[PDB]
Amino acid sequence: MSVGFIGAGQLAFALAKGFTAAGVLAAHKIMASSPDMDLATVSALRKMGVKLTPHNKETVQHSDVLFLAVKPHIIPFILDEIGADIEDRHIVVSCAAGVTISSIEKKLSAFRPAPRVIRCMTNTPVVVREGATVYATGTHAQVEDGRLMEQLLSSVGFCTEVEEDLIDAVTGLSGSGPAYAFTALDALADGGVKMGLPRRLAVRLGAQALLGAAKMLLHSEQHPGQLKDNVSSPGGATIHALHVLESGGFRSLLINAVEASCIRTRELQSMAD
Amino acid sequence: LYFQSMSVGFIGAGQLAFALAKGFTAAGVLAAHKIMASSPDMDLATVSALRKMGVKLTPHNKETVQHSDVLFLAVKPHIIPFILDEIGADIEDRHIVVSCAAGVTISSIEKKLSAFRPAPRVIRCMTNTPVVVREGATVYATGTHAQVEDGRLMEQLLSSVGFCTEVEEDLIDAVTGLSGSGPAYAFTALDALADGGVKMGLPRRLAVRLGAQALLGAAKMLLHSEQHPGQLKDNVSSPGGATIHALHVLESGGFRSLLINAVEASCIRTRELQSMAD
Amino acid sequence: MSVGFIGAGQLAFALAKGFTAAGVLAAHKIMASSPDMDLATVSALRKMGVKLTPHNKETVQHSDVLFLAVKPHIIPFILDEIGADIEDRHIVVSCAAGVTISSIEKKLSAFRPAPRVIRCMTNTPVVVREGATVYATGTHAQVEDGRLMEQLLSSVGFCTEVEEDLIDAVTGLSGSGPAYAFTALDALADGGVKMGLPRRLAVRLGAQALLGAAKMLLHSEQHPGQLKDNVSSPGGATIHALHVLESGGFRSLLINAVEASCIRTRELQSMAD
Amino acid sequence: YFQSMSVGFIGAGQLAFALAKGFTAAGVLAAHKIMASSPDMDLATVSALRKMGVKLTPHNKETVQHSDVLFLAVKPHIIPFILDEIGADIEDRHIVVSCAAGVTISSIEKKLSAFRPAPRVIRCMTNTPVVVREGATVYATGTHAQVEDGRLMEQLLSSVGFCTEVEEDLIDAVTGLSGSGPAYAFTALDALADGGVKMGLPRRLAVRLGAQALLGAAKMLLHSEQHPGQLKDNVSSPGGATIHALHVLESGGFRSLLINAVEASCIRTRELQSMAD
Amino acid sequence: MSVGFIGAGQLAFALAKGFTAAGVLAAHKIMASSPDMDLATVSALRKMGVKLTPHNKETVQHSDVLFLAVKPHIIPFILDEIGADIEDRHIVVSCAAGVTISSIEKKLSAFRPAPRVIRCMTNTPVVVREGATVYATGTHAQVEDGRLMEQLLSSVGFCTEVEEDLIDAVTGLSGSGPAYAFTALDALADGGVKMGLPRRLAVRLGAQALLGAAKMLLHSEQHPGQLKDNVSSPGGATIHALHVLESGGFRSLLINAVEASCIRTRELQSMAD
Ligand SMILES: O=S(=O)(O)N1CCCC1
């Protein structure tokens, strides 16, 4: 099977690296196009063995599954450029935040009537095969197209089908989520440094603490509040630290973040639906 | 490189015109007598210093246009449309019109000027006052009829007084909020840092000097590093030490968020200052 | 003249790089010792041509001016280790935050009666020859020792003599200052990114804005408030941004920072004075 | 250079009293050359104008016929009723000086022009400290103001404080700054005195000291070429009492509160436009 | 009558300029001594007619009334230098914040038994003859010494005698007060500029408003709240602005400042009482 990437940014590189590391795709069965070849992301894809071309048309010809890993305001230009080159065999997978299936189908249908479109929202940890991906199938997607998508994206993390009207909220949670985690880990490490740890050890310990806690929850049937209860001895250090988190409205800030990212994602709609 | 020895004009003789004229003459790319500036108010302290520099001053904007090859519009954004009606008939094929006003779009300038002569050569720029010490930060966008080398000429000129690069025009309002207003954020921070030094027992003059030197060296380190500012921050803070204690109290006040708020507020206000039909 | 460094951390590397780049010292006339040779700072000093040794005693023998660029709680151990090896020719320059001249002289005087001690507070931008350094001369420092120190440290930035009781406050201002600036620049760049700039351009513009503003003030006789007034047109973008800084108590946060760093520096005193 | 000049106030409230008191104390106007009208002859301001020697009448018409310079010292929403009432009585000799916040020259000229075509209108924003001849006044001249009209206005208002001409579009902002400014200062002085009392001072002494401090600082700045931040720097010894107190002001966002105040007063003034311009 | 200043900083200049502008002292009857008069005051005092000497003892020998205008921690050093040079004719006027009469008398009495001491708290607006001064008379001050002090300091502003235990509070109110006013004027001008005024005009209007309001209160019998009530029309601009001041706790910030300055002044007591 042939996979192509339009756009060679962080997400394109991350998926290719994840895909090849899973053994589900040979790097040569992958082609990627970028309008900017000076990107650092484009340098590393060459070392992988991924074919690179400056013309999106060449990507479309080599590819069967076609990932649109470009910015939301760029999608309509890409669709206008290659819409004439879409064939029956193509599955077009848009990774752009906010951009609706119906808006993509509308553009592509001016060229050929039944484009097979899938919309997805993934995140950068696909690069270490621990991404979180959702997808929704378009009007003309065959039932096997969604199955194919799920099998491919399951190789690099969690993947599940959702109704399209959930994807803006997913973007605010697992799409933007890694950034919330990177911010938290920087701050936790500053906290470790303030109390006397070397920075390198503090980063390692904080990241290991977050990874292990996340894995515990994924492998548990218990509520996060129950796992929280299990950490804190009465009168102990942990419950004292939880109090100061609570006094600052820590929970409210993370709710605010998911909401703000979701609301901004809805504003990012560019084309007519 | 490009041989200049051209005439530059400033419509407006305020802080920006003085800062650019001072920077340009200090760089040696322009002689002061090849510069002409016009102001509706000849009593400005910036006007007196331009006179002593040897810059030619005139109350008549038309005379600046007739003198100039490169014409900087260094007036307030709402003043731009009056200037354009006033001198539009005087724009010749030789002119490059460089608007420095915050918010004012190229298309709004081209529309007004096209009513007189069809293909005005227009450049939009956003620079800042540190051009006066040749460490400005300048971006520019070229208009519809800007000729092949107009952008190259603009970049060569503005690079003599600091950083300069071409951008898409739709980035300029955000640049305005960051490096246009930026020096004011820094001056506020330096006043406050000196107040802190004085609180802890330093003489005011020493505290101002140390704080400014700290900001300058840190900024230079980052411009000369390939590392993330967070990594440079990490390299500086020993475990349990004075710096990480100070960083905590900055974080508790939402220091980072205040600077984000400032860039956003300046960018948003700049959009509002759109004074013409773009 | 011979210079040596006890400790091969960030500050040792920064001074050596600054010194050699100024042409005031050949890299071979410099020797540095580290208890941890696996430090990244130690790797680069080798490429410079600076002599490295694992034994502080060897540094003392090669050196005339001796920089103590180790952590405050480490100074007393270093002094106990090499105090017997101090000679009449040595000028001992302590860079450690908080550690008093009298405490260093007391330790060294148990070995030989008139140690020539200088205390200094510098910062990492000496690495690009724009440091801010102050120093105070000890009881037995000759008048030419301070002059020598000032000439050496002026090659890598601003340098001036202060009374020792100002150095804790200097530490809170120009010692910790660069970190305040790195934090501000990260945030300013986040602000530029929020409003649509690429991150690389936003970092460059923010850093250039801060450098130029700093240089303007250093080259001006005017008050920072006057230079601030000159930036803001009435009703304009800048004055709107200054208002939101003021509403958050921006000035108070920077005062808080200088104070907190100064107060913590006084707590870092380790030895008996 | 006008001792023949008659001045009228439509409105006999705080502002009319303050200006009449200041003018008469300045010696530029004899109190008998001043007439004031009010729909309420019971105000304490009316009873004080009477003992000052000002002529008082309930008829705005009579004030108009008495006056050469006519101050409109009524609330903004009252201006249109005044203008309809006395518009037909405006003569060529009249200079109509509106003091109401927010009310535009063009709105006033539009009303008066329905009667006689070229009314001479000046808009000003002053403040109550004219009553001790330390007011802060700006003015803008209307379409048909003669060039001597602005010079005359500035000569008259300079006798009771600072006075300068501005473009009209600055007057709403001036209103938020020097118009409302005295009230900010009275609030600050009450609070400073509470602080002095908290720390052990008698109330009367604390008020005197705080008011003298503010007066002297303001005069220092007015007589200095230096930035207010520079004078601040000159006051604060390192480690001293003043810089400690400045820190606690900064921690509460003191500067931002005063910016908020000028902004809020200016914005409200723009909402008080009553007439169509 | 001869007047001397030990110290040539901001306060000594301001009193000397005010005294000479008052015409109550011939400038040639004024001498001032400083070890480091590098402020422009050296050429300003000379043009003013003030005699300048580097030796504090020369000032003592010239002067009848001797103003100590040095920092509180410098006072005990001055008293030890000039103590043997105090004569019966001298009135010693300390302007230092926090330093008590009893601590000055104890110091000087080691030299001669009945030093005539006055403690003063004034402020910089004496330079425009609108200062605010309080003074307390010491144990051996003659009854005419206080009268002399009040006649002198009344020429440059308000002056009244207080009990000494009120002077710390006066320091927090009228001593520090001018700085509160300068901060307020800078911010008010920033407000004016935000709403469209040129900076120079905004500064002038704000300062004039402050000056006029203060003069109204000084010349009124009415409470400041009553003067506030007289300025605010119902529903008007001023009452809207007062609301936003109240919402930020504006009154409490000024109480906090007087308190903080007073408390810090009590900490500045340098000598033993
Ligand atoms: O004191 S506890 O909160 O029980 N504890 C649990 C993990 C580390 C500290």
Ligand SMILES: O=S(=O)(O)N1CCCC1
């Ligand atoms: O609108 S301004 O505040 O005058 N301006 C100055 C620099 C960038 C924006």
Ligand SMILES: O=S(=O)(O)N1CCCC1
């Ligand atoms: O104690 S530290 O925070 O490592 N230090 C480094 C520079 C000034 C203070």
Ligand SMILES: O=S(=O)(O)N1CCCC1
């Ligand atoms: O201690 S100071 O802050 O320098 N001082 C100045 C006048 C009142 C108190």
Ligand SMILES: O=S(=O)(O)N1CCCC1
């Ligand atoms: O509308 S008011 O609040 O009464 N007014 C008084 C002078 C400035 C504005």
